[PDB]
Structure 1
């Protein structure tokens, strides 16, 4: 078991829509999704004090940043992105 009620969630990539096509289309692309995986606490929706450890605690949600940096192809200024994703939900002891 774990101190916090953390649940895996899959997020589908945003689907490009061919609204130009008034005709129906295969849902096969809708059928399979590569997706990404995240984590969140539903512990009272992430409110539990991590009960079975009695020390003064409250469950926190923790994030991670991915840094992809590439100098532009047109040799413009270097482009750096830091996408943030909810990665873990962890319990921390607190004062009084």
Structure 2
């Protein structure tokens, strides 16, 4: 890991998470692994872990990103099955 902070790379198939307050669109009929995203998770207590080889005021932080959609899956109410508001890379 020639990078700054330890991180976790996961490929979870999320069940309920939305940019708005409603993930029910994705709580029904996602049982054939319709989607999978290589979500990166920072090391536990990222704030308590400033980057190695440095002592900057900015320690490792994890940001977010989105992915909307229009695709028609095998369920009725799927305005966009692609997940939005997803955590992003960890860096100082």
Structure 2 spans left out of the alignment, 5+ residues: none
Aligned residues: 91
Structure 1 spans left out of the alignment, 5+ residues: 92-96
- TM-score by length of structure 2 reads 0.52
Residue of structure 2 in register with 1:94 after alignment: none
Larger radius of gyration: 1
Maintained 8 Å contact 2:68/2:84? yes
- TM-superposition CA deviations, 1:18-67 (whole Å, max 9, x none): 99999999999989785221011115455301131122231111111234
Maintained 8 Å contact 2:69/2:82? yes
Aligned residues: CA RMSD: 9.8
- TM-score by length of structure 1 reads 0.51
Maintained 8 Å contact 1:40/1:46? no
Residue of structure 1 in register with 2:18 after alignment: 17
> Which one has the bigger strand percentage?
1
Maintained 8 Å contact 2:15/2:26? no
CA distance in 2, matches of 1:20, 1:84: 11
